[PDB]
């Protein structure tokens, strides 16, 4: 997700892959399947 190694030491530029990751989120993540907010009555 930044650079991958090709033969003879050259690289493949994957900076766009990391640029999308910085947009999706942006250290430990904690899940919580419980209800997050109050429920509104009908």
């Amino acid at each position: 997700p930044y650079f991958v190694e090709t033969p003879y030491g050259f690289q493949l530029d994957l900076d766009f892959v990391k640029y999308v990751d910085d947009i999706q989120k942006g250290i430990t993540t904690i899940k919580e399947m419980g209800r997050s907010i109050h429920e509104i009555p009908r």
Binding site: T6, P7, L12, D13, L14, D15, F16, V20, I23
Partner: protein, 306 residues
């Protein structure tokens, strides 16, 4: 002589890149029905797919495994096609969003799927009664065109659900039922005329295709009418200036990725070539830079934000 059955993936993928390139030359009507936020989601998801594809292209062409190389070539192709489609759709929305621009309605029908379906029965008329294609072959000669007649009724049905004139909507439903009931009369021709077919009922089997062909000709003639003709939008000078950064980055992405696949073709034939790996490394950076500038331009140029 080798790698011949792996080059076809590279040859066909580049053709698909040439085809989607046609979308960026002049957007005047939308490519699809994507929301602008849906274009951001499509571009970001295809970038995740294109990244895995490029790594597969290099690691495969490094040490054989040509079947996986063809999969990565086809995967990178379809990912770049999703890039172009979402970029052209977003570029159009940015253009028409200018207060001094116009709107361009899309055609109510697509006179291309009906043209191929017309040839599915036109070239099948003489292919069932001439010294070239004889009897027996009814499993293929009927099914390959029945899928198009059913798709004809499906395309003609949704075409009525979009027009405002009930005169056309009534005619679309009528023309769709004409192709359907004419095929329904052909169902009886398939029910019989199986083994007892020495001109025992073939005169009536063709008699069911006559209303099947003339109703398709009647539907195709109605598809090229006013209102149904698409209208291009009038993008203002400021709207053209705002959409070009998305278009230019999309054009550069395709031209840089095409040279990458072209270089990957030569390295798939023979990987022991440091200069060729250097050219691939150079194209990989211009591809990544074009994607970053494309995503950044689409994010900044939302039709709501200033």
């Amino acid at each position: 002589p080798f790698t011949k059955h792996g080059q076809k993936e590279c040859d066909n993928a580049l053709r698909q890149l040439e085809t989607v390139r046609e979308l960026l030359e002049n957007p005047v009507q939308p490519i699809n029905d994507m929301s602008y936020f849906g274009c951001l989601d499509s571009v970001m998801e295809n970038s995740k797919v294109l990244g895995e594809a490029m790594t597969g292209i290099s690691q495969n062409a490094k040490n054989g495994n040509l079947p996986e190389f063809g999969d990565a070539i086809a995967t990178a192709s379809k990912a770049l096609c999703g890039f172009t489609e979402a970029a052209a759709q977003a570029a159009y929305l940015v253009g028409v969003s200018d207060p001094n621009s116009q709107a361009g309605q899309q055609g109510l029908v697509e006179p291309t799927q009906f043209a191929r379906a017309n040839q599915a029965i036109q070239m099948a008329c003489q292919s069932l009664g001439e010294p070239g294609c004889t009897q027996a072959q009814v499993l293929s000669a009927a099914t390959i065109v029945a899928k198009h007649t059913s798709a004809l009724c499906n395309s003609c049905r949704l075409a009525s659900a979009r027009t405002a004139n009930p005169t056309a909507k009534r005619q679309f439903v009528q023309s769709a039922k004409e192709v359907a009931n004419s095929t329904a009369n052909l169902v009886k021709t398939i029910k019989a005329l199986d083994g007892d077919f020495t001109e025992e009922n073939r005169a009536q089997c063709r008699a069911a295709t006559a209303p099947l062909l003339e109703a398709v000709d009647n539907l195709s003639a109605f598809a090229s009418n006013p209102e149904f003709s698409s209208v291009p939008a009038q993008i203002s000078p400021e709207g053209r200036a705002a959409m070009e950064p998305i278009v230019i980055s999309a054009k550069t992405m395709l031209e840089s990725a095409g040279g990458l696949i072209q270089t990957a073709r030569a390295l798939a034939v023979n990987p022991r070539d440091p200069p060729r790996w250097s050219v691939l490394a150079g194209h990989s950076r211009t591809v990544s830079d074009s994607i970053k500038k494309l995503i950044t331009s689409m994010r900044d140029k939302a039709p709501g934000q200033l």
